[model samples]
Target chain A: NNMNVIIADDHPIVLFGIRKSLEQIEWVNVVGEFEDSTALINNLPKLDAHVLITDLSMPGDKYGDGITLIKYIKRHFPSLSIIVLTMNNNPAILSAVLDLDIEGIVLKQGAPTDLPKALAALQKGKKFTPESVSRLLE
Target chain B: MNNMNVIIADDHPIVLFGIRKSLEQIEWVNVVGEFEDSTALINNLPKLDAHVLITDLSMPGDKYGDGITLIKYIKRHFPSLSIIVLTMNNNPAILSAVLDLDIEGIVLKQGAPTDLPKALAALQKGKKFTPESVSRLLE
Candidate 1:
């Protein structure tokens, strides 16, 4: 069995980086990718994906990034697991995201290797909290 | 022929590790101290006799707190010690505030592999350094 993953980010570089990282894992199949919140929200229902790795902030039309986008997805597609990616290093901002009950959070500024660990943790039905974010909590 | 005594602080282990590794590359740079929080850094500063202090902007675990407070403390207490900010924050206002404190070098963690060493080299040559990636935030 393989994980069907959908990804989204405003930055093309990060989006490409994330998809490429996912591609390296044999058990992961990135089903779809979106560059904006609008596109991700619109196509999410159509894609039979188990995980959604989305940027915390992707300014776009309707349900724009951060808590708004996260809330909408959690409410609409409750079955999908979420892995939030963020450039924000502030503890307050990151703490807010952690409170959202997502599967994991990968700091966009931190190691890209965190992506694979997040996916593995999610696959095991455990929360993936990166040390960069977790250290802030403590 | 004098070795550059540098002190570094970052809450993230990997960032600290990478910074220490980068500092090690420059033969003249000697990382005298490393800390995980602002409190530890401040406490150990006197003993280190460091020439340059490279620190993270968001480290917690200090009664006085992080960010400007900690930076200001270091600047006030050790005016002679050069300060370099290594951070992931891209906020222009925050970055500007840090720069206003007379931070000699500001390097973003993502670009640290190349930028950190450049920062050290520039400092050694008696110059300030700010990579374009960080300077872009102010514009």
Candidate 2:
């Protein structure tokens, strides 16, 4: 069975890149891609995705990004496996995301390899974070 | 001509990798050093002869200090060195404090792909750079 994934990021290039990367993995079917959280929240229900990969900060959205938007997704889509893609190394922010008990956390800088790894971990219901981001928690 | 000598510091390897890739595009920018923590940065800074210092705001292994305190120390210690803060945080209070310190540039991580090069260009022209993405956070 193919895995349906929804991806969101404010940057056009990043959005393009994520989709391009997804194309490489045969199992990943990118069902939808959004430029911000607003579009994502609105369209997610219609798409029926198994995983959600999103940037930590995206402008031009009432839902906002970071913890606020993340918490919303967690509440509304309890079954959806979430992968957080962030450019931040701030312990407070990283730790907060960890506290959310999400299945995946990856830095935008490391997404080329980390994103796929995160997907693989989530496949087995195991939590994942790149060593760099995970070390910040300690 | 390799006119600009730059040094950068950040805790994340991938971020540093991205920064290095961006810095490489500018032929004039000669990256003399890179550090993962403030202590290494401060200890090695005196001998580097760098023209610019690009650093992350929330470095963890900062034995010297962290936040505004570390920045203030850098400014005071290296009076002529231009500073560019590369951070993901858009906290207005922290942003305002950094601005007050007269830091030369700020490039939010979201905009780093383009903004880092732009920031270096601005500094090369003796101008302070603040990406619109960062300035908007102030409002």
- The best candidate by DockQ is 2
Model 2 steric clash pairs: none
| CA displacement after TM-score superposition, residue B50 of candidate 1 (Å) | 0.9
Kindly list the per-residue Cα lDDT of model 1 for residues B1-139, writing each as its tens digit.
3588988887655456556545555788888987877778888999889999988898776585899998898889999999989876867778778888888998875442467788878887888887443556645
Off by over 4 Å in 2: A1-35, A39-52, A56-81, A86-103, A107-138, B88-93, B109-113, B131-139
Estimate, for each residue in A1-138, the C-alpha lDDT of model 2 and write its tens digit. 578999887655366556655656888988997877888999989999999999898874578889999899989998898999877779998998889988889886453578778887887769898887866677
Return the clash pairs for model 1, or none.
none
Residue B5's lDDT in candidate 1:
91
**Cα lDDT of model 2 overall?**
0.81
Candidate 2 is graded, for docking, as: incorrect
Off by over 4 Å in 1: A1-138, B110-112, B131-139
Residue-level lDDT tens digits of model 1 in A17-59: 5755776688898899787788888898888999998888776
- In lDDT terms, which candidate is top? 2
For model 2 chain A, give the 10-residue run with minimal summed lDDT. Answer: A11-20
